[PDB]
């Protein structure tokens, strides 16, 4: 069995100069995984789902860093898909990141959520790539 950590996060800051479109905050969501691990060893790509109000609702990042820098006026629930090079399920993992912006004139919002994921039946090359990334076999 293989047990690997992941870390999702986002930041949001009030725009000092509101734009003509009416946007008041700048927000960035990023998937980086745990501390000091090249996720690319086992993640083929990452998919970011944005509110349809944004143009190009579906963003794709095929190499790290995996991110979506954007501007807006309101938050939402943002789906994220992390697809691995796994040869069998789990081949993809879905998260529902609560993307929220800082209102109430508080200091800018910064959020980090840590999660744990499981893979089964790892092969020798699978274990090799996980150890390249630092994954731990349990």
Partner 1 sequence: DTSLPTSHTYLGADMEEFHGRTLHDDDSCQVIPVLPQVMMILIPGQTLPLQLFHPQEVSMVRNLIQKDRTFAVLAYAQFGTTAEIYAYREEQDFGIEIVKVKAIGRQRFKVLELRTQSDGIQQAKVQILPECVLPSTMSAVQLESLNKCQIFPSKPDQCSYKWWQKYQKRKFHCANLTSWPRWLYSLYDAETLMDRIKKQLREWDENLKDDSLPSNPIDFSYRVAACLPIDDVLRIQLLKIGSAIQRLRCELDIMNKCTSLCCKQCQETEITTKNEIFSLSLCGPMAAYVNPHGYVHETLTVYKACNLNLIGRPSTEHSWFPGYAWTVAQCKICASHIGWKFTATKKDMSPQKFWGLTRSALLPTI
Contact footprint for ligand A1IQT (CB under 6 A) = 23, 51, 53-55, 69-74, 76
By CB under 8 A, is residue 104 in contact with partner 1?
A: no
Q: Residue 102 touches which of partner 1, ligand A1IQT, none (CB < 5 to 8 A by kind)?
A: partner 1
Phi and psi dihedrals of 62, rounded to 5?
-95, -15
The 64-103 site mask, x for binding partner 1 (CB under 8 A), equals xx-x-x--------------------------------x-
Place of tokens 């991110």: 67
Residue nearest to ligand A1IQT (CB): 72
Return the DSSP state at 30. Answer: E
Return the DSSP state at 126. Answer: H
Task: Determine which helix (DSSP H) or strand (DSSP E) holds 129, and give its type and residue range.
Answer: helix 124-133
Q: Residue 65 touches which of partner 1, ligand A1IQT, none (CB < 5 to 8 A by kind)?
A: partner 1
Q: Residue 70 touches which of partner 1, ligand A1IQT, none (CB < 5 to 8 A by kind)?
A: ligand A1IQT
For residues 121 and 134, give the distance between their C-alpha atoms in angstroms, rounded to a whole number. Answer: 17
Sign of the torsion angle spanned by Cα atoms 107, 15, 101, 35: negative
Spatial CA neighbour of 104 closest among 25, 34, 31, 48: 25
Query: Using CB under 8 A, which of 5, 13, 79, 85 touches partner 1?
Result: 13
For residues 31 and 135, give the distance between their C-alpha atoms in angstroms, rounded to a whole number. Answer: 17
Residues contributing to the site for partner 1 (CB under 8 A): 11-13, 17, 20, 26, 28, 35-36, 38, 56, 64-65, 67, 69, 102, 107-110, 134
């Amino acid at each position: 069995t293989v047990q690997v950590r992941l870390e999702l996060g986002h930041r949001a800051q009030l725009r000092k100069k509101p734009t003509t479109e009416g946007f008041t905050h700048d927000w960035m969501v990023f998937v980086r995984g745990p501390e000091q691990c090249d996720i690319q060893h086992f993640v083929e790509k990452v998919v970011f789902w944005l509110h349809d109000s944004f143009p190009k609702p579906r963003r794709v990042c095929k190499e790290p860093p995996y991110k979506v820098e954007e501007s807006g006026y309101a938050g939402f629930i943002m789906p994220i898909e992390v697809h691995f090079k796994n040869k069998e399920e789990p081949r993809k993992v879905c998260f529902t990141y609560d993307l929220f912006l800082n209102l109430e004139g508080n200091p800018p919002v910064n959020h980090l959520r840590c999660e744990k994921l499981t893979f089964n039946n790892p092969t020798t090359e699978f274990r090799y790539k996980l150890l390249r990334a630092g994954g731990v076999m349990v």
